[PDB]
Design an enzyme around this catalytic site. Structure first.
Site, PDB file in Angstrom:
ATOM      1  N   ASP A  69       9.535  11.518  -1.584  1.00 31.41           N
ATOM      2  CA  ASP A  69       9.864  10.893  -3.265  1.00 31.41           C
ATOM      3  C   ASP A  69      11.109  12.078  -3.311  1.00 31.41           C
ATOM      4  O   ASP A  69      11.883  13.579  -3.269  1.00 31.41           O
ATOM      5  CB  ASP A  69       8.883  11.636  -4.119  1.00 31.41           C
TER       6      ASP A  69
ATOM      7  N   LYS B 144      14.690   6.772  -7.640  1.00 32.03           N
ATOM      8  CA  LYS B 144      15.024   6.976  -9.236  1.00 32.03           C
ATOM      9  C   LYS B 144      15.948   7.049  -9.368  1.00 32.03           C
ATOM     10  O   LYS B 144      17.622   7.441  -9.011  1.00 32.03           O
ATOM     11  CB  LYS B 144      13.981   8.251  -9.910  1.00 32.03           C
TER      12      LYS B 144
ATOM     13  N   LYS C 261       0.989  -1.219   0.225  1.00 37.84           N
ATOM     14  CA  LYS C 261       0.365  -0.005   0.248  1.00 37.84           C
ATOM     15  C   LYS C 261       0.969   0.801  -0.120  1.00 37.84           C
ATOM     16  O   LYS C 261       1.816   1.749   0.665  1.00 37.84           O
ATOM     17  CB  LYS C 261      -1.218   0.208   1.322  1.00 37.84           C
ATOM     18  N   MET C 262       0.311   2.635  -0.938  1.00 37.81           N
ATOM     19  CA  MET C 262       1.094   3.183  -1.337  1.00 37.81           C
ATOM     20  C   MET C 262       0.455   4.837  -0.634  1.00 37.81           C
ATOM     21  O   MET C 262      -0.705   5.366  -0.736  1.00 37.81           O
ATOM     22  CB  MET C 262       1.696   3.888  -2.731  1.00 37.81           C
ATOM     23  N   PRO C 263       0.862   5.312   0.271  1.00 30.23           N
ATOM     24  CA  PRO C 263       0.681   6.256   0.437  1.00 30.23           C
ATOM     25  C   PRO C 263       0.332   7.682  -0.098  1.00 30.23           C
ATOM     26  O   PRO C 263       0.906   7.497  -1.089  1.00 30.23           O
ATOM     27  CB  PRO C 263       1.054   7.730   1.765  1.00 30.23           C
ATOM     28  N   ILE C 264      -1.121   7.994  -0.641  1.00 26.83           N
ATOM     29  CA  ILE C 264      -1.367   8.766  -1.807  1.00 26.83           C
ATOM     30  C   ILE C 264      -0.962  10.410  -1.626  1.00 26.83           C
ATOM     31  O   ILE C 264      -1.046  10.635  -2.380  1.00 26.83           O
ATOM     32  CB  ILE C 264      -3.324   8.586  -2.079  1.00 26.83           C
ATOM     33  N   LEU C 265      -0.543  10.629  -0.931  1.00 20.43           N
ATOM     34  CA  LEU C 265       0.070  12.221  -0.654  1.00 20.43           C
ATOM     35  C   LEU C 265       1.392  12.121  -0.281  1.00 20.43           C
ATOM     36  O   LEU C 265       1.655  11.067   0.976  1.00 20.43           O
ATOM     37  CB  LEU C 265      -0.480  13.223   0.415  1.00 20.43           C
ATOM     38  N   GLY C 266       2.674  12.354  -1.125  1.00 19.96           N
ATOM     39  CA  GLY C 266       3.838  12.583  -0.121  1.00 19.96           C
ATOM     40  C   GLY C 266       4.257  13.858  -0.574  1.00 19.96           C
ATOM     41  O   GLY C 266       3.858  14.946  -0.991  1.00 19.96           O
TER      42      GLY C 266
HETATM   43  N1  LIG Z   1       9.594  12.285 -12.250  1.00 22.59           N
HETATM   44  C1  LIG Z   1      10.114  13.867 -12.812  1.00 22.59           C
HETATM   45  O1  LIG Z   1      10.821  13.792 -13.506  1.00 22.59           O
HETATM   46  C2  LIG Z   1       9.908  14.959 -11.338  1.00 22.59           C
HETATM   47  C3  LIG Z   1       9.918  15.793 -12.316  1.00 22.59           C
HETATM   48  C4  LIG Z   1       9.024  16.948 -12.013  1.00 22.59           C
HETATM   49  C5  LIG Z   1       9.033  16.864 -10.369  1.00 22.59           C
HETATM   50  N2  LIG Z   1       9.095  15.324  -9.857  1.00 22.59           N
HETATM   51  C6  LIG Z   1       8.506  14.995  -8.040  1.00 22.59           C
HETATM   52  O2  LIG Z   1       7.560  16.046  -7.745  1.00 22.59           O
HETATM   53  C7  LIG Z   1       7.877  17.257  -7.145  1.00 22.59           C
HETATM   54  C8  LIG Z   1       6.721  18.132  -7.146  1.00 22.59           C
HETATM   55  O3  LIG Z   1       6.769  19.054  -7.888  1.00 22.59           O
HETATM   56  P1  LIG Z   1       7.523  20.242  -8.026  1.00 22.59           P
HETATM   57  O4  LIG Z   1       8.575  20.473  -7.014  1.00 22.59           O
HETATM   58  O5  LIG Z   1       8.215  20.152  -9.860  1.00 22.59           O
HETATM   59  O6  LIG Z   1       6.222  21.390  -8.028  1.00 22.59           O
HETATM   60  P2  LIG Z   1       5.127  21.746  -7.087  1.00 22.59           P
HETATM   61  O7  LIG Z   1       5.338  20.299  -6.457  1.00 22.59           O
HETATM   62  O8  LIG Z   1       3.881  22.131  -8.517  1.00 22.59           O
HETATM   63  O9  LIG Z   1       5.348  22.568  -6.473  1.00 22.59           O
HETATM   64  C9  LIG Z   1       6.564  22.849  -5.891  1.00 22.59           C
HETATM   65  C10 LIG Z   1       7.063  24.502  -5.374  1.00 22.59           C
HETATM   66  O10 LIG Z   1       4.971  24.969  -5.097  1.00 22.59           O
HETATM   67  C11 LIG Z   1       5.850  25.526  -3.377  1.00 22.59           C
HETATM   68  N3  LIG Z   1       5.215  25.522  -2.948  1.00 22.59           N
HETATM   69  C12 LIG Z   1       4.120  24.761  -1.936  1.00 22.59           C
HETATM   70  N4  LIG Z   1       3.397  24.195  -1.298  1.00 22.59           N
HETATM   71  C13 LIG Z   1       2.896  25.550  -1.932  1.00 22.59           C
HETATM   72  C14 LIG Z   1       2.218  26.448  -1.096  1.00 22.59           C
HETATM   73  N5  LIG Z   1       0.695  25.629  -0.535  1.00 22.59           N
HETATM   74  N6  LIG Z   1       1.137  27.288  -1.192  1.00 22.59           N
HETATM   75  C15 LIG Z   1       2.079  28.091  -2.004  1.00 22.59           C
HETATM   76  N7  LIG Z   1       3.278  27.726  -2.893  1.00 22.59           N
HETATM   77  C16 LIG Z   1       3.625  26.328  -2.430  1.00 22.59           C
HETATM   78  C17 LIG Z   1       7.067  25.594  -3.484  1.00 22.59           C
HETATM   79  O11 LIG Z   1       7.904  26.737  -2.292  1.00 22.59           O
HETATM   80  P3  LIG Z   1       8.239  26.160  -0.783  1.00 22.59           P
HETATM   81  O12 LIG Z   1       9.627  24.881  -1.440  1.00 22.59           O
HETATM   82  O13 LIG Z   1       9.244  27.265  -0.872  1.00 22.59           O
HETATM   83  O14 LIG Z   1       7.734  26.300   0.324  1.00 22.59           O
HETATM   84  C18 LIG Z   1       7.931  25.188  -4.924  1.00 22.59           C
HETATM   85  O15 LIG Z   1       7.996  26.236  -5.396  1.00 22.59           O
HETATM   86  C19 LIG Z   1       9.322  17.269  -6.863  1.00 22.59           C
HETATM   87  O16 LIG Z   1      10.000  18.022  -5.585  1.00 22.59           O
HETATM   88  C20 LIG Z   1       9.939  16.124  -7.376  1.00 22.59           C
HETATM   89  O17 LIG Z   1       9.731  14.975  -5.742  1.00 22.59           O
HETATM   90  C21 LIG Z   1       9.463  14.268 -10.314  1.00 22.59           C
HETATM   91  O1  LIG Z   2      12.747  14.880 -11.496  1.00 28.76           O
HETATM   92  C1  LIG Z   2      13.279  15.946 -12.419  1.00 28.76           C
HETATM   93  C2  LIG Z   2      12.194  17.152 -12.086  1.00 28.76           C
HETATM   94  F1  LIG Z   2      11.972  17.238 -11.222  1.00 28.76           F
HETATM   95  C3  LIG Z   2      12.959  17.793 -13.494  1.00 28.76           C
HETATM   96  F2  LIG Z   2      12.091  18.705 -12.843  1.00 28.76           F
HETATM   97  C4  LIG Z   2      14.066  17.826 -14.354  1.00 28.76           C
HETATM   98  C5  LIG Z   2      13.931  19.295 -15.855  1.00 28.76           C
HETATM   99  C6  LIG Z   2      13.088  18.867 -16.243  1.00 28.76           C
HETATM  100  F3  LIG Z   2      12.003  18.611 -16.179  1.00 28.76           F
HETATM  101  C7  LIG Z   2      12.803  20.285 -17.443  1.00 28.76           C
HETATM  102  F4  LIG Z   2      12.215  20.310 -18.081  1.00 28.76           F
HETATM  103  C8  LIG Z   2      13.781  20.790 -17.650  1.00 28.76           C
HETATM  104  O2  LIG Z   2      14.821  21.267 -18.331  1.00 28.76           O
HETATM  105  C9  LIG Z   2      15.678  20.309 -16.141  1.00 28.76           C
HETATM  106  F5  LIG Z   2      17.028  20.907 -16.975  1.00 28.76           F
HETATM  107  C10 LIG Z   2      15.177  19.143 -15.781  1.00 28.76           C
HETATM  108  F6  LIG Z   2      15.928  18.511 -14.349  1.00 28.76           F
HETATM  109  C11 LIG Z   2      14.131  16.258 -14.446  1.00 28.76           C
HETATM  110  F7  LIG Z   2      14.895  16.040 -15.514  1.00 28.76           F
HETATM  111  C12 LIG Z   2      13.790  15.694 -13.209  1.00 28.76           C
HETATM  112  F8  LIG Z   2      14.869  14.370 -13.672  1.00 28.76           F
END
Ligand SMILES: NC(=O)c1ccc[n+]([C@@H]2O[C@H](COP(=O)([O-])OP(=O)(O)OC[C@H]3O[C@@H](n4cnc5c(N)ncnc54)[C@H](OP(=O)(O)O)[C@@H]3O)[C@@H](O)[C@H]2O)c1
Ligand SMILES: Oc1c(F)c(F)c(-c2c(F)c(F)c(O)c(F)c2F)c(F)c1F
EC number: 1.1.1.21
Length: 316
Positions: A44, A78, A12-17
């Site tokens: 994450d 990852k 089981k995976m928590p739906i909020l992380g």
């Molecule tokens: N697999 C992939 O390729 C990939 C790509 C992108 C993201 N991810 C994962 O998904 C996570 C989430 O995506 P993300 O980091 O791109 O962006 P996000 O979670 O959509 O947005 C994060 C931003 O929102 C701000 N924030 C957070 N809660 C807020 C609130 N309640 N009110 C106003 N602003 C708020 C944060 O500021 P503060 O931190 O300054 O509070 C930060 O600037 C990542 O951190 C990563 O773990 C994975």
């Molecule tokens: O987990 C990742 C992430 F949160 C990113 F934003 C990026 C990422 C992205 F989405 C981009 F669109 C970029 O241009 C970039 F340089 C990045 F590093 C990424 F590659 C990741 F692997």
């Protein structure tokens, strides 16, 4: 609704992380401590984020403090693109385990379908600026991921940023031993992802929504870009429910049977983002939010469009 979703490995995976991309290394230890203190049980992570050691310090303290037991946590990391070679996968996983100070991961994802040349650089470039690919077939990378399950390093394996054809290739792998448990993809009201989500869910693959707030801190943001947190229509839905816009943005994927991983290092926002289990968006609200779809992709990895497995040329 229930706080965890059942994966196809039986766990089981928590739906909020809690997301950790761009969580500064000097702030992420306290962020994760706060998150665990207010109830988060899913973090994450990724090697490429360069902060796993600091995330691990927080996890270890909270285990030591007996705030949480290891079995209650759901830790995700990852495999970076420069480790797709079958002989590099185990060491990459082990480095992540070492930094996080864990003896297993709950879920380990192939971070992107694109393999790059191994080496110190996360984005190895040719002299003309193109990313240098790996010739390792993703199916071979998948077999190497399966070995991690069989060696006890990880409880589940999955994928991230795979398009439906790429998911299909894994599902159709000759001799497939373990299906991917999760596909982690960008998803929010401006990129609603109906087609890819339906495909994955139909195959029993759980979808995790990343950048649910639109990643307002992304380095490549432009001042004129669309903004979910400032969209007055979303603000109005939030006001109707006596919640914040971020809380609506987090609840939205939850009601689509998705997992969601908002990132914050701000203690008050970490707490705010967790307070999403005490209200329900109506079907009309859900359809209205879905109607805001733009096909606006914030994480398009534009530097890698010259890759044969670059995932976003395909419609979905
Ligand atoms: N697999 C992939 O390729 C990939 C790509 C992108 C993201 N991810 C994962 O998904 C996570 C989430 O995506 P993300 O980091 O791109 O962006 P996000 O979670 O959509 O947005 C994060 C931003 O929102 C701000 N924030 C957070 N809660 C807020 C609130 N309640 N009110 C106003 N602003 C708020 C944060 O500021 P503060 O931190 O300054 O509070 C930060 O600037 C990542 O951190 C990563 O773990 C994975
Ligand atoms: O987990 C990742 C992430 F949160 C990113 F934003 C990026 C990422 C992205 F989405 C981009 F669109 C970029 O241009 C970039 F340089 C990045 F590093 C990424 F590659 C990741 F692997």
């Amino acid at each position: 609704m229930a706080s965890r979703i059942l994966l196809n490995n039986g766990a089981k995976m928590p739906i909020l992380g809690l997301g950790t991309w761009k969580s500064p290394p000097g702030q992420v230890t306290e962020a994760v401590k706060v998150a665990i203190d207010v109830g988060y049980r899913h973090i994450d992570c990724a090697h490429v984020y360069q902060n796993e050691n600091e995330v691990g310090v927080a996890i270890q303290e909270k285990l030591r403090e007996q705030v949480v037991k290891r079995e209650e946590l759901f830790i995700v990391s990852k495999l970076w693109c420069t480790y797709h070679e079958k002989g590099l996968v185990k060491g990459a996983c082990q480095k992540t385990l070492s930094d996080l100070k864990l003896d297993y991961l709950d879920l380990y994802l192939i971070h992107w379908p694109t393999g790059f040349k191994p080496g110190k650089e996360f984005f190895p470039l040719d002299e003309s600026g193109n990313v240098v690919p790996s010739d390792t077939n993703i199916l071979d990378t998948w077999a190497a991921m399966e070995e991690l399950v069989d060696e006890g390093l990880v409880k589940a394996i999955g994928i991230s940023n795979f398009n439906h054809l790429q998911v299909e290739m894994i599902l159709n792998k000759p001799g497939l031993k373990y299906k991917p448990a999760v596909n982690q993809i960008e998803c929010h009201p401006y990129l609603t992802q109906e087609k890819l989500i339906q495909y994955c869910q139909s195959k029993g693959i759980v979808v995790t929504a990343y950048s649910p707030l639109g990643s307002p801190d992304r380095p490549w943001a432009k001042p004129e870009d669309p903004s979910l947190l400032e969209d007055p229509r979303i603000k109005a839905i939030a006001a109707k429910h006596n919640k914040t816009t971020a809380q609506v943005l987090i609840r939205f994927p939850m009601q689509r049977n998705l997992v969601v991983i908002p990132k914050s290092v701000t203690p008050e926002r970490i707490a705010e983002n967790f307070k999403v289990f005490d209200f329900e968006l109506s079907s009309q609200d859900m359809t209205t939010l879905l109607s805001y779809n733009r096909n606006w992709r914030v994480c398009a990895l534009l530097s890698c469009t010259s890759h044969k497995d670059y995932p976003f040329h395909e419609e979905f």
